[PDB]
Each structure stands twice: as C-alpha cells, then as structure tokens.
Ligand binder design. Structure first.
Ligand code: CLA
Ligand code: CLA
Ligand code: CLA
Ligand code: CLA
Ligand code: CLA
Ligand code: CLA
Ligand code: CLA
Ligand code: CLA
Ligand SMILES: CCCCCCCCCCCCCCCC(=O)OC[C@H](CO[C@@H]1O[C@H](CS(=O)(=O)O)[C@@H](O)[C@H](O)[C@H]1O)OC(=O)CCCCCCCCCCCCCCC
Ligand SMILES: CC1=CCCC(C)(C)[C@H]1/C=C/C(C)=C/C=C/C(C)=C/C=C/C=C(C)/C=C/C=C(C)/C=C/C1=C(C)CCCC1(C)C
Lengths: 173, 187
C-alpha cells in the first residue's frame, strides 16, 4: 500500500498495472477508472515522447527550420502555419484510433482495454505475461516521464539552457 | 483537602468527562473543557501536529544561530523569515507542506471516522517502536512531553528575541536584562 495511514481506495482492486492503492484524493471514485487509465497512459506516452524530443532538439535540428535557444523556444521559431498541421494531424489520429468516439459517454462502448488503440505494428505484445510486464513498465515509465517533462520544460524556461547543457553548466538562479 | 474525586494534575478540579486516560500524556488537565466541545481525536491530532512542528522549530531556532549554511546568508532566524520570503524559498516550503497536509487532511477525516489513531501517520522507517508494543506507549509519552516542551520553548525563545534582540545562544552567554533596568530610574 502506497499510503499506509489511509485505507485502500475502494475502486483500486489491482487489476490495472501499477496499482498500489495510491488515490488519497479519491479520483477512482466518482469517475470512470477506464477513462482515468487511458488518460494516464496518454499523458505518459505524450510526455514519454516529449522527453526524447527535448533531448534530440538540442543537438539535432531539421534542415527546414532554424534552431532556437531552447527546445521550449523551438516552438516559437517555427512558423504558425505547419504548427496547425501538427494539431490537425493529431486530431485525425485521435479521431481514427478512438473510433470517432471522443467523450466519456460513448467511449468504451465495446469495453476495449484503456489505452489500447490497436497499435502493435511490430507484434511485441503477444505473450500475456510479457504483456503484463510491459504494461507495468510502460505505466511506470510514463509516471516517471511526465514528472521529468514537467521538470525539464520549466528548467529550460527559467535558465534559458538545454537540459544536457544545464547539467554540464550547473549554476544557481 | 476536602473529600471528593478530582483530577490527578489539578487537585481542585474534577477529572474531565472525555479525558478517560486511554490517550498518552493525559494527567486530567483540561480546565476549560475543550474536550467537551470538540472531539478528543481531532484535538490530539492538532496537539501532535503543533508539537512536532514546534520540535522542528526549536531545533531550527538553535541550529540557525549555531550554524548557517554556506548559501543564504548569516542572519538571525526571525528576520531570516522575511529574507526567505523575499528570496522565494519559503513559498516553496509552504507549497510542499501544503502538499503534505492535503493527505494529512484526509488522514484527519478518517480519524473522525475512527479508522486511524490520532496523529498516527504510520511513519516508522527505522522501526524504533514498531515491532515492540511496550516501547510504543513510552515513546508516545516521551513524544507528547517533548511536544509540549517544544511549544513552550519556541514561544519563549521568540518572545525573548522580541524584547532582547539577541540570539538564544547569544542570550545564554551575554545575558542582559531588558529595557536597561540595571541602572534605570523611575521605570
Ligand atoms: C494527469 C495524469 C494522470 C492521470 C489521469 C492518472 C490516473 C490514475 N492514476 Mg496516476 N500518476 C500520475 C499521473 C496520472 N495518473 C503521475 C504523474 C504519477 C507519478 C507521481 C502517478 C502515480 C500513480 C500511482 C502510484 C498510482 C496511480 C493510480 C492511478 C489511477 C487511480 C485514479 C487516480 O488517482 O486519479 C488520478 C487523478 C489525477 C492525476 C488528477 C489530479 C489533478 C490535480 C488537480 C493536479 C495535481 C498535480 C500535482 C502537482 C488512475 C488511472 C493508481 C493506480 O494504478 O490504480 C489503478 C496508483 O496506485 N498513479
Ligand atoms: C511528442 C512530442 C513532440 C512534440 C510536441 C514535438 C514538436 C516539435 N518538434 Mg519534435 N521530436 C520529437 C517529439 C516531439 N516534437 C521526438 C520524439 C523527436 C526525436 C525523433 C523529435 C525530433 C525533432 C527534431 C530533430 C526537430 C523537431 C522539431 C519540432 C518542432 C517543429 C515541428 C516538427 O517538424 O516536428 C518534427 C518532429 C518529429 C518528426 C518527431 C515526430 C516523432 C513522434 C511521432 C512524435 C515542433 C515544436 C524541429 C524544430 O524545433 O526545429 C527548430 C526539429 O528540427 N523535433
Ligand atoms: C516504456 C516504453 C513503452 C512500453 C514498455 C510500451 C508497452 C506497450 N505498449 Mg506502448 N507506447 C509507448 C511506449 C511504450 N509502450 C509510447 C512512447 C507510445 C506513443 C507513441 C506508445 C503507444 C502505444 C499504443 C498506441 C499502444 C501501445 C501498446 C502497448 C502494449 C503492447 C505493445 C508492445 O508490446 O509494445 C512493446 C514496446 C516496446 C518494447 C518499446 C520499445 C522501444 C524501443 C526499445 C526504444 C524506442 C526507440 C527510441 C530510442 C525512442 C505494451 C504494454 C498497445 C496496447 O495497449 O496493447 C494492449 C497500443 O494499442 N503503446
Ligand atoms: C524527475 C524529477 C525531477 C528531478 C530529478 C529534478 C531535478 C532538478 N530540478 Mg526540477 N522539477 C521537477 C522535477 C524534477 N526536478 C518538476 C516536476 C518541476 C515542475 C514544478 C520542476 C521544476 C524545477 C524548477 C523550476 C527548477 C528545478 C531545478 C532542478 C535542479 C535543482 C533542484 C534542487 O535544488 O534539488 C535539479 C537538477 C532548478 C534548476 O534549474 O536547477 C539549477 C529550478 O530552478 N526544477
Ligand atoms: C519546521 C521548522 C523549521 C522551519 C520553519 C525552518 C525554516 C528555515 N530554516 Mg531551518 N532547520 C530546522 C527546522 C526548520 N527550519 C531544523 C530542524 C534544522 C536542523 C536540521 C534546521 C537547520 C537549518 C539550517 C542549518 C539553516 C536553516 C535555514 C532556514 C531558513 C531557510 C529555509 C531553508 O532552507 O530551511 C532549511 C531547513 C532544513 C534543511 C531543515 C529540514 C530538516 C527537517 C526535515 C525539518 C528558513 C527560515 C537556513 C537559514 O538560516 O536561512 C537564512 C540555514 O542555513 N535551517
Ligand atoms: C525534488 C523536488 C524538488 C525540486 C525539484 C525543487 C526545486 C527547487 N527548490 Mg526546493 N524543496 C523541496 C523539493 C524540491 N525543490 C522540498 C521537499 C523542500 C522542503 C519543504 C524544499 C525547500 C526549498 C527551499 C527552502 C528553497 C528551495 C529552492 C529551490 C529552487 C532552487 C534550485 C537550485 O538552483 O538549487 C541548485 C541545487 C543544487 C546545487 C543541489 C544541492 C542543493 C543543496 C546543497 C542540497 C540541500 C541541502 C539541505 C537539505 C538544505 C528550485 C526551484 C530555493 C529557492 O527558492 O530558490 C531561489 C530555496 O530557497 N526549495
Ligand atoms: C524526540 C521526539 C520524538 C519522539 C519520542 C517521537 C516518537 C514517535 N513518533 Mg515522532 N516525530 C518527531 C519527534 C518524535 N517522535 C518529529 C520532530 C516529527 C516531525 C518530523 C515526527 C513525526 C512523526 C510521524 C509522521 C510519525 C511519528 C511516529 C512516532 C511513533 C512511532 C515512531 C517511533 O518509534 O519513533 C521513535 C522516535 C525516537 C526514538 C526519537 C528519535 C529522535 C532522533 C534521534 C532525533 C534526531 C536528531 C536531531 C538532529 C536532534 C513514536 C511514538 C509515528 C506514529 O504516530 O506512530 C504511532 C508516525 O507516523 N512521528
Ligand atoms: C522553556 C520555558 C521557558 C524558559 C526556561 C524561560 C526562561 C526565561 N525567560 Mg521566558 N518565556 C517562555 C518560556 C520560558 N522562558 C514563554 C512560553 C514565553 C511566552 C510568553 C516567554 C516570554 C519571555 C519574555 C517576554 C521574556 C522572557 C525572559 C526569560 C528569561 C528571564 C527569566 C525571568 O525573568 O523569569 C529566562 C531565561 C526575559 C528575558 O529575555 O530575559 C532577559 C523576557 O523579557 N521570557
Ligand atoms: C459562561 C460561563 C457559564 O456560566 O457557563 C458554564 C460553561 C463552563 O462550564 C464548563 O464545564 C466543564 C466541566 S463539565 O462540562 O460539566 O464536565 C469545565 O471544563 C469548565 O468549567 C467549563 O468548560 O460555559 C463556559 O464557560 C464554556 C467554557 C469556555 C471554553 C470552552 C472550550 C472550547 C472553546 C470553543
Ligand atoms: C505523489 C508523489 C510520488 C512520490 C514522490 C513524491 C513524494 C515527491 C510525491 C510528489 C510528486 C510531485 C510533486 C509531482 C509534481 C508534478 C508537476 C508539478 C507536474 C507539472 C508539469 C507541468 C507541465 C507538464 C507544463 C507543460 C507546458 C507545456 C507542455 C507548454 C508550454 C508552452 C509552449 C512552449 C507552447 C505555447 C504555450 C506554452 C504554455 C508557452
């Protein structure tokens, strides 16, 4: 149990990966646990790719664009047009992968697994025990990566330095 | 002097209605009857929270005058409050303690339901009194006595600084009476 001085939340049986009974504020109750699980997986995956993007944008820059001082400022130096192309592409992906159901009501109509968008092109998730281990690994890595992204974005905003550049040139504020 | 049942601490006041003696540190001292108006569990949790904060406060009020970190600056703690307010670190102390008290409030609301002991956050990483039960109540009595002593001590140190304008270590080595009373006339 993650919080020993509080009770185990009533809706956290332990079926999902990474469930250690950590919900003191009780979002498991009064909401849909599948919705929260898919939201957690989506945030984890987005930040998980975002950390790698912040690492790559320091040393690797696409020849079409001009690199900024920080990967945070790389959002501004690229033109406004093309940014909305990314916005609309993500909208199309989130519409087609979710089956054009986009609300807490109509989603999970077929009761699919939360976070299972049917995207396994390499076929890694075949063995169910390995599937559960990879579920746990993915969820814990997302829980680490969201905190990491929230840290590194603010570090790049405050110090105006890259993350590796900041780690090699550590200084007080 | 007259026959009758009274409290163990105060002999002219009766034992309070809700102070049965199960809780540690209970010598029957509740003259105004705070336990009659509010629950004893919430009061015990508030007492333990105040006492632990006061323990750390007395330790800080000693150490900060005894030894200041290489960062920040050499300054007395009472104006160091303002210094760290202007520096921004005290707002972060506030944020992190608020984040802890968010779960503390849920613990308190489960204490009213009677699911956890008041002030029992189950925090014993060194298992100093976890496996043994006889040591647990002795350490609880010691903790509550140190809590009350620390509240009194921090109040004393702060109000000594407020009129003396000297450090606690400074005052026990350079003890001067207040207001120039050694050679004061018509005071
Ligand atoms: C916003 C992202 C997000 C979401 C939707 C979830 C969702 C969930 N988490 Mg989770 N988690 C997250 C981020 C998130 N997590 C991060 C970043 C960490 C690392 C600290 C964890 C660590 C964690 C553990 C250790 C456990 C969960 C569990 C759970 C499930 C229980 C429901 C719950 O607590 O609601 C979460 C509700 C929110 C996150 C909303 C909070 C919004 C406030 C206002 C902002 C707080 C910000 C702070 C500064 C649920 C599926 C439990 C589980 O697996 O049970 C199935 C469990 O044991 N989470
Ligand atoms: C998932 C989070 C995320 C987000 C929001 C962005 C957003 C952005 N990236 Mg980026 N990137 C990401 C992940 C991400 N990237 C990852 C994982 C990598 C490593 C492969 C990169 C590598 C990368 C490079 C090398 C460059 C950008 C650049 C940019 C900016 C211009 C748009 C562009 O051409 O993107 C291109 C991004 C991709 C093709 C990565 C997509 C991979 C998955 C699907 C995401 C834009 C702000 C450019 C920039 O800022 O120029 C100044 C630029 O030169 N990115
Ligand atoms: C920590 C990384 C990690 C791990 C362990 C998993 C694990 C899993 N994902 Mg997943 N995913 C991740 C990152 C990860 N993902 C990211 C970043 C995204 C966003 C693009 C997604 C998007 C995604 C979708 C949309 C779906 C899954 C699904 C799955 C499950 C079946 C697929 C599988 O076996 O993949 C195994 C994956 C790996 C072994 C990762 C290899 C990564 C290499 C080694 C490094 C990456 C290269 C470069 C350095 C970056 C499985 C539990 C599917 C599912 O839920 O099925 C039940 C599903 O529908 N994932
Ligand atoms: C993965 C978790 C993680 C880790 C390892 C770090 C680590 C660090 N952070 Mg950080 N941070 C995190 C999450 C994390 N943060 C999150 C979630 C946020 C969002 C609130 C921030 C916001 C943040 C700021 C605003 C600053 C740091 C700074 C720092 C550095 C000094 C912090 C210190 O005194 O100790 C250090 C490298 C400081 C820095 O830049 O160091 C010079 C600094 O100013 N962090
Ligand atoms: C809850 C009581 C409490 C409070 C409100 C403070 C508040 C403060 N302390 Mg402090 N301190 C405390 C307990 C406390 N301390 C204890 C118990 C110790 C002994 C370990 C210290 C040792 C200490 C030193 C050595 C220094 C401070 C300093 C400071 C000031 C800068 C903030 C900081 O970095 O704190 C740091 C506080 C700690 C690292 C103590 C945390 C230990 C536990 C978790 C509490 C700030 C006014 C600095 C100062 O004078 O600023 C001008 C400084 O140099 N404190
Ligand atoms: C992992 C979580 C985390 C993170 C990322 C931060 C991040 C930060 N804190 Mg912080 N803090 C945290 C938890 C965290 N805090 C907690 C739990 C407390 C106790 C309530 C505090 C109490 C606190 C105070 C009192 C102060 C900060 C300050 C800072 C900032 C200065 C960072 C820097 O440049 O130092 C560089 C980091 C290093 C050089 C690494 C070593 C740091 C020292 C030597 C270790 C600490 C020794 C001892 C415990 C004190 C930065 C935004 C300061 C601030 O506001 O900046 C102006 C400040 O005064 N924090
Ligand atoms: C000397 C004072 C003192 C004493 C006797 C206790 C005693 C106790 N505390 Mg406690 N506590 C204290 C100070 C103290 N605490 C302070 C200052 C804090 C704030 C950080 C806490 C925070 C705290 C929490 C959050 C919890 C306890 C709990 C407990 C109980 C079980 C843990 C245990 O065996 O600890 C034994 C403790 C000692 C033998 C004292 C060690 C003193 C060290 C060596 C001083 C450090 C050196 C320093 C620089 C000076 C026990 C009755 C748990 C509880 O309620 O369970 C019933 C619990 O969940 N305490
Ligand atoms: C641990 C408990 C404790 C102890 C040992 C002391 C001890 C002392 N206090 Mg004190 N004090 C205490 C609690 C305590 N106080 C509390 C709880 C408060 C808050 C009301 C005060 C407020 C206070 C003031 C306002 C003054 C003292 C002063 C003094 C000193 C003069 C003694 C005297 O005249 O009688 C003495 C060292 C005086 C002083 O500074 O001595 C020069 C002084 O002016 N105390
Ligand atoms: C007004 C005085 C009066 O005549 O009424 C009698 C009561 C006091 O009798 C109460 O009686 C208590 C003993 S018992 O209630 O009879 O068990 C005793 O603790 C104390 O005298 C007093 O609290 O009125 C009070 O003075 C209330 C106590 C003041 C402090 C309350 C504690 C919680 C604060 C909120
Ligand atoms: C619960 C827990 C587990 C065990 C450890 C511990 C005891 C510490 C305890 C505490 C955990 C804590 C404190 C977690 C903290 C999480 C936090 C603060 C997460 C915050 C993340 C912030 C984020 C993403 C910000 C994202 C901003 C983004 C994208 C975009 C920025 C911008 C760009 C460049 C485009 C234009 C718009 C804008 C805004 C300028």
């Amino acid at each position: 149990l993650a919080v020993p001085f509080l009770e185990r939340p009533p809706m956290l049986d332990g079926s999902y990966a990474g469930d250690i009974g950590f919900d003191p504020v009780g979002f498991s109750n009064y909401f849909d646990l599948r919705w929260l699980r898919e939201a957690e997986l989506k945030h984890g995956r987005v930040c998980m790719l975002g950390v790698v993007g912040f690492l790559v944008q320091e040393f690797v820059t696409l020849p079409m664009f001009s690199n900024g001082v920080t990967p945070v400022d790389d959002f501004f130096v690229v033109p406004a047009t093309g940014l909305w192309q990314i916005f609309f592409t993500i909208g199309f992906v989130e519409a087609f992968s979710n089956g054009f159901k986009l609300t807490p009501s109509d989603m999970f109509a077929d009761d699919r697994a939360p976070g299972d968008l049917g995207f396994d092109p390499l076929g890694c998730g075949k063995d169910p025990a390995a599937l559960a281990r990879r579920q746990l690994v993915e969820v814990k890595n997302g829980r680490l990566a969201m905190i990491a992204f929230g840290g590194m974005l603010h570090q790049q905003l405050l110090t105006k330095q890259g993350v590796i550049e900041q780690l090699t040139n550590f200084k007080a504020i | 002097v007259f026959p009758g049942q009274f409290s163990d601490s105060v002999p002219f006041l009766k034992q309070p209605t809700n102070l049965d003696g199960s809780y540690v540190g209970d010598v029957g001292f509740d003259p105004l009857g705070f336990s009659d108006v509010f629950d004893i569990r919430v009061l015990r949790e508030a007492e333990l929270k105040h006492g632990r904060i006061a323990m750390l406060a007395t330790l800080g009020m000693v150490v900060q005058e005894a030894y200041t970190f290489p960062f920040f600056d050499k300054v007395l703690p009472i104006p160091a409050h303002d210094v760290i307010v202007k520096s921004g670190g005290m707002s972060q102390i506030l944020l992190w303690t608020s984040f802890a008290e968010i779960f503390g409030g849920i613990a308190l609301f489960q204490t009213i339901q009677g699911k956890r002991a008041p002030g029992d956050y189950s925090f014993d990483p060194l298992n100093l009194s976890a496996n043994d039960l006889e040591k647990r109540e002795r350490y609880a009595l010691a903790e509550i006595k140190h809590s009350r002593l620390a509240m009194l001590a921090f109040s004393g140190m702060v109000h000594q600084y407020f009129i003396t304008n000297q450090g606690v270590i400074e005052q026990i080595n350079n003890f001067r009476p207040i207001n120039g009373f050694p050679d004061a006339t018509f005071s």
